[PDB]
Amino acid sequence: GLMQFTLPVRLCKEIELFHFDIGPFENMWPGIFVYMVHRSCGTSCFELEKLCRFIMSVKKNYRRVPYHNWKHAVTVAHCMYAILQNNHTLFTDLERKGLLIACLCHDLDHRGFSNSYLQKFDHPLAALYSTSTMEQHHFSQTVSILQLEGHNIFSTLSSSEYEQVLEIIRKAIIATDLALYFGNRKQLEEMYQTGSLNLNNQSHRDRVIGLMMTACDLCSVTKLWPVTKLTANDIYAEFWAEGDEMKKLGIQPIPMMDRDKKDEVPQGQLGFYNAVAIPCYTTLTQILPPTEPLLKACRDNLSQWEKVIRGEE
Ligand SMILES: Cn1cc(-c2ccccc2)nc1COc1nc2ccccc2nc1Cl
Ligand SMILES: [Mg+2]
Ligand SMILES: [Zn+2]
């Protein structure tokens, strides 16, 4: 009850900033997450023993892949923490509870392969879940862990609060399917500019939480340049392995996944900042003005990729 987590001074200050990097010490990531729940939600939100058992079972169900790993889970939860802390009064008690957990769980048991690769492979998960294949699996793995003995962190909620939080988590996790982001953002763009955006309309909140989820999930583009640039190596290590696996099925992969086309990465990052990241953080900033540092950091990183193309690095 009286047991705070406390971080060293540099981490205590920097964890509050959007561009915080959780560092290379894996054993500190659980404590960093509990710290964020305790400040975001409260020391009362979860029984510490249950929360600790939940976190360690979640960790165990992330795989040793280059990018879609336990570090990504905690990184995406920290971005959500910074959004929630900068928008104190906009979110319900249940939302603060659900969203940090949703972010920690959002890529559970990822294999380092896209929905496309599973469908082309004819993976069993592609027959069980015809759209948002991996994201339905990530939600399925979250419910599994919540149902293990001693892992039910929501046990003090009523039946209908419990149903609501699990529905916040399902929609949050489904929204991390980038195929769904383009339409979600166009609708938010229209709603904001015709003035119809209403945060009391549940279906509107759902859309805004979905964009928050895209923003947290892509947050590697919002770090200081050396973090962004080194994370890009991990992202492409997966893409290129998928490309190899497409070539094994007798399919020329897209260039983004073809390691023979490494030279075109700087131009591919440009397209992604312009087509995905910038539009994402721009619409997020219009809806939630205090998230503007994410858009500013993304813009700085776009400018760094422009310098790479110009051979200035
Ligand atoms: C779109 N695109 C095309 C290329 C390309 C590269 C080499 C050769 C030919 C084409 N690279 C990208 C970059 O793509 C992404 N970067 C991400 C960065 C961070 C977090 C999620 C991301 N998700 C995606 Cl999909
Ligand atoms: Mg994912
Ligand atoms: Zn993710």
Residue nearest to atom 11 of ligand 1 (CA): 268
Whether 150 contacts 51, CB under 8 Å: no
Rounded to 5 degrees, what are φ and ψ at 226? -60, -30
Residue 263 neighbours by CB distance under 10 Å = 7
Q: What is the DSSP string of 149-212?
A: TT--TTTTS-HHHHHHHHHHHHHHHHTT-HHHHHHHHHHHHHHHHTT---TTSHHHHHHHHHHH
* Residue 220 beta carbon below 6 angstroms from any ligand 1 atom: yes
Domains of the chain: 28-310 (1.10.1300.10)
Residue nearest to atom 22 of ligand 1 (CA): 218
| Ion ligand 2 — residues with CB < 5 Å | 107, 176
Residue from 35, 70, 277, 90 nearest 178 by CA:
277
Whether 67 contacts 235, CB under 8 Å: yes
Q: How far apart are CA 238 and CA 241, in angstroms?
A: 5
Residue nearest to atom 24 of ligand 1 (CA): 272
Residue nearest to atom 10 of ligand 1 (CA): 256
Which residues are CB-neighbours of 262 under 8 A, at least 6 positions away? 236
Determine the distance separating the centroid of ligand 2 and the alpha carbon of 131, expressed in angstroms.
13
As given in the structure block, the two tokens for residue 201 are 């309309």
Which residues are CB-neighbours of 237 under 8 A, at least 6 positions away? 66, 67
Q: Which experimental method was this entry solved with?
A: X-ray
Q: Which residue has the tokens 């149903």?
A: 163
Breaks (C-N over 2.5 A) in the chain follow: none
* Residue 265 beta carbon below 6 angstroms from any ligand 1 atom: yes
| Axis crossing angle, helix 278-287 with helix 178-193, rounded to the nearest 10 | 40
Residue from 180, 226, 212 nearest 76 by CA:
212
Whether 127 contacts 81, CB under 8 Å: no
- Could you list the residues known to form a binding site for 3',5'-cyclic AMP, using ranges: 68, 269
For the chain, how are helix, strand and coil distributed in percent, rounded to 5?
A: 70, 0, 30
Determine the distance separating the centroid of ligand 3 and the alpha carbon of 213, expressed in angstroms.
9
* Residue 176 beta carbon below 6 angstroms from any ligand 1 atom: no
Residue from 138, 81, 73 nearest 104 by CA:
73
Biggest distance spanned by C-alpha atoms of the chain? 60
H helical segments located in the chain: 9-14, 29-40, 48-60, 70-86, 93-105, 115-121, 124-128, 133-147, 159-174, 178-193, 202-217, 225-248, 265-272, 278-287, 292-309
Residue from 41, 35, 112, 104 nearest 74 by CA:
104
Resolution (A): 2.0
Nearest-atom number in ligand 1 for the CA of 258 is 8
As given in the structure block, the two tokens for residue 193 are 């500019």
* Residue 261 beta carbon below 6 angstroms from any ligand 1 atom: yes
- Residues marked as catalytic: 68
Determine the distance separating the centroid of ligand 2 and the alpha carbon of 296, expressed in angstroms.
24
